[PDB]
Design a protein around this nucleic acid. Structure first.
Lengths: 99, 309, 50, 98, 32, 201
DNA sequence: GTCCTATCGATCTTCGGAAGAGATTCAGAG
DNA sequence: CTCTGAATCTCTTCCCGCGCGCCGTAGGAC
């Protein structure tokens, strides 16, 4: 199995999982410790945002790749904004802060 | 026969408080001294004891007055780092000088340590069935072992210090890997210990603004101390205290990284009534919000960002 | 020794303790208690060693 | 003197609970211990509660809770459950009359 | 083999270095 | 987002049943006893004035029916979340802390100096944040933005049972009833029914 | 047959997890 | 008379991936 691009889930925009659906492989928890254990930071940033979750960045990435520009704009993943609202849907005011 | 000396469990205070004794004697009323010693050769019998040497026996130097007759694979590392106290915690002595009995065994025994100088009245409740390595007359230190059984790191840290608990944990974990043939460099265990004992407990707040007793991250008190010492005001003093990792993580100073581990509804409410604030130093928080980790290549960027400052 | 733990006097005080330990918040009652106790061990609707 | 009490039924089977309650009264013939049974209705408050004119013995309490599809009384406690009020009964009868 | 580089994530390397062999454990005078 | 306006205050389960209770600890009141108020099992007494009653001191409905005529209304006691909200609102919070941080010294008793160290920490944390104690009690309940809880159709004309929309449905039904029975002025026993069922939803 | 409203407000949620830790409940006594 | 010991209760945790397979509100009233 292999996936360039295709479906994304509705609640959070991460890719579907499967062969019965054209899914992307889970870069699961242990793999992230494995990247962190190399120095590899940019790989990780990509793997869990641009390749994955950032609804802007992935379409800007795709176009930069067809243009062959080899550059990314990383943003902030929409699954994390899901978390904020799911906490803020408790009476817990969590918020992003500036300084 | 050899006589059975009575157990404190088999006989009353009229036997307990009558604690059995075997002083060596002469019509001089005292023994020939060791130079600089006042102590007579008074000696004593514990419970269970077997005694052949009744009254009027001539005793030599070296004679036995009496005799007293008497773990795992992976869990024995998991419960090591979590620093769980064992079932059978060896009673370790404290401060210094010399032991004594306190008051005898009913409900339990109570026994005492009394120094060369200072606070004589330190006393401790002690279990009966762990046979004692000392009786009444024995010179003792913080960290001398009063029973057998395995140690407990909380106390080792209290009694032989951080270096001694590192040396303990590194040995007693590698004794698992060396047994099963595995190799690991020792430094990768110290790096967990380094984290196990990141917290500290305030004994003197001194001139510092911590609560009159508080638990604090050790770096936070240390950085307050260094500048207050440069101001020459009385710095705070503390004990470092050894949390097991399953707790020393929830005690991280930064709720996102703790809350995303376990006990979420604890951390995410305890932090919420405190109104707590997170600066996103460290790795796991930066992964959650999906930015460069402050490590490796991303450390070098965070460093340049922080240097051009 | 068990009679040194025992808070009961006789049958009814035990049935009281049973019904209160088993169905806390319901009232004990002489005509009502047996409709617990018998259906624990002695009635076909609710106890059956095959 | 018979005072009022509130009974909770499975909401939706309320008329059948009222009929079965009248029938259990005329079975176990404690006819001197029950006055009426109210389910008020507007062109339906209250949504699932049955009003019973009653007295309080433990026998009649077991009778009403042995009526099928009845959860229990609603009061301060389950030992001595609670009657409601004089003016509250009068106002419910007022809006039932109006 | 040389000294560590400033910035390396030593913590995560250690935790993994303890855990990797974690499957290989089990859960159950001589000379003058 | 949107919100629901609740027909009564309501305790937030988290702060009721965390490790300790943040509610109970702040009040010095045992968890079982605030729950005994919040699920309507007993009253709690406030502003006790010229009567023989204490500052929180839950009293059974027998023991309130006592006070209702042993005393007039030179005191109060309430039931349900409003009563806890009033108790939290009653907190002269800094003055309680200033006292308690002295009452710390009033014995050397380890067996409360430490759970009191906890309480004197907590009060100062509520002081140092912007927070206020009544906010442990809800009154507007936020509802999750709908795309995060979508009601997707499946195989034919059926919606996927999309759990939260069954939970909010429970709430809002109960709240619709409670607004009704409040404005139609139901008696205490009926409103304590619906108010229990709402808090329990 | 379709539409709307509600749940054991007249039972019985499974015993065959260990643990491990905390909150919360009680001894022998000064 | 409740103070430090200990005692019973609940809460919380239990590998990572992966692939299939199926199965998916009810009851009552108008």
């Amino acid at each position: 199995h292999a996936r360039s691009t295709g479906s994304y889930s509705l609640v959070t925009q991460q890719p579907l999982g499967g062969k019965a659906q054209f899914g992307g492989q889970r870069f699961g928890e242990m793999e992230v410790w494995a990247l962190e254990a190399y120095g590899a930071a940019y790989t990780l940033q990509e793997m869990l945002t641009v390749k994955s979750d950032d609804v802007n960045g992935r379409t800007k990435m795709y176009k930069n790749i067809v243009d062959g520009n080899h550059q990314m704009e990383p943003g902030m993943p929409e699954s994390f904004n899901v978390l904020l609202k799911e906490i803020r849907s408790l009476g817990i005011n969590i918020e992003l802060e500036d300084e | 026969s050899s006589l059975v000396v009575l157990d404190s469990a088999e006989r009353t205070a009229g036997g307990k408080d009558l604690r059995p004794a075997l002083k060596i004697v002469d019509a001089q009323g005292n023994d020939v001294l060791i130079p600089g010693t006042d102590m007579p050769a008074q000696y004593f019998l514990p419970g269970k004891a077997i005694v052949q040497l009744e009254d009027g026996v001539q005793i030599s130097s070296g004679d036995t007055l009496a005799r007293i007759p008497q773990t795992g694979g992976l869990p024995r590392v998991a419960d090591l780092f979590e620093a769980r106290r064992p079932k059978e915690p060896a009673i370790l002595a404290e401060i210094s000088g010399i032991v004594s009995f306190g008051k005898e065994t009913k409900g339990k025994r109570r026994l005492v340590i009394t120094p060369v100088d200072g606070s004589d009245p330190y006393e401790e409740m002690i279990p009966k069935w762990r046979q004692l390595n000392v009786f009444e007359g024995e010179r003792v230190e913080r960290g001398d072992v009063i029973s057998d059984g395995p140690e407990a790191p909380h106390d080792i840290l209290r009694l032989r210090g951080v270096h001694a608990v590192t040396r303990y944990i590194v040995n007693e974990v590698q004794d698992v890997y060396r047994l099963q043939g595995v190799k690991i460099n020792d430094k990768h265990i110290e790096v967990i210990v380094r984290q196990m004992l990141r917290k500290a407990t305030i004994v003197n707040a001194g001139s510092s603004d911590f609560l009159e007793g508080e638990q604090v991250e050790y770096s936070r008190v240390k950085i307050a101390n260094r500048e207050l010492e440069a101001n020459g005001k009385v710095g705070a003093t503390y004990s470092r205290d050894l949390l097991g990792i399953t707790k020393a993580s929830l005690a991280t100073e930064s709720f996102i990284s703790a809350a995303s581990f376990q006990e979420t509804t604890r951390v995410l409410t305890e932090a919420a009534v405190a109104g707590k604030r997170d600066e996103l130093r460290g790795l796991k928080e930066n992964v959650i919000v999906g930015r460069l980790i402050p490590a490796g290549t991303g450390y070098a960027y965070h460093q340049d960002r922080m240097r051009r400052r | 020794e068990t009679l040194r733990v025992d808070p009961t006097n006789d049958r009814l005080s035990a049935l009281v303790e049973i019904y209160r330990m088993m169905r806390p918040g319901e009232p004990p009652t002489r005509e009502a208690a047996e409709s617990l106790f018998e259906n624990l061990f002695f009635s076909e609707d609710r106890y059956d060693l095959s | 003197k018979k005072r009022w009490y509130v009974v909770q039924a499975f909401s939706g089977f309320e008329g059948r609970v009222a009929t079965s309650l009248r029938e259990h009264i005329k079975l176990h013939n404690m006819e001197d211990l029950f006055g009426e049974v109210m389910v008020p209705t507007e062109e339906k408050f209250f949504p699932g509660y049955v009003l019973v004119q009653m007295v309080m013995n433990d026998a009649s309490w077991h009778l009403v809770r042995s009526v099928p599809r009845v959860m229990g009384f609603i009061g301060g406690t389950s030992d001595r459950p609670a009657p409601i009020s004089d003016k509250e009964v009068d106002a419910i009868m007022n809006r039932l009359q109006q | 083999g040389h000294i560590i580089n400033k910035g390396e994530a030593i913590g995560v390397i250690a935790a993994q270095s303890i855990g990797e062999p974690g499957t290989q454990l089990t859960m159950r005078v001589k000379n003058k | 987002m949107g919100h629901i306006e609740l027909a009564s205050p309501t305790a937030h389960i988290w702060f009721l049943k965390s490790l300790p209770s943040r509610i109970g600890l702040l009040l010095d009141m045992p968890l079982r006893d605030i729950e005994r108020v919040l699920y309507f099992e007993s009253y709690v007494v406030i502003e006790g004035g010229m009567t023989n009653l204490e500052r929180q001191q839950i009293l059974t409905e027998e023991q309130y029916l006592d006070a209702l005529e042993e005393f007039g209304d030179e005191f109060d006691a309430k039931m349900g979340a409003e009563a806890i909200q009033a108790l939290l609102k009653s907190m002269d919070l800094e003055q309680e802390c200033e006292q308690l941080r002295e009452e710390l010294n009033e014995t050397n008793s380890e067996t409360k100096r430490k759970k009191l160290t906890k309480r004197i920490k907590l009060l100062e944390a509520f002081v140092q944040s912007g927070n206020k104690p009544e906010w442990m009690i809800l009154t507007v309940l936020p509802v999750l933005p709908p795309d995060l809880r979508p009601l997707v159709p499946l195989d034919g004309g059926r919606f996927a049972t999309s759990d939260l929309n069954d939970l909010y449905r429970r709430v809002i039904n109960r709240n619709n009833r409670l607004k009704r029975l409040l404005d139609l002025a139901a008696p205490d026993i009926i409103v304590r029914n619906e108010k229990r069922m709402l808090q329990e939803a």
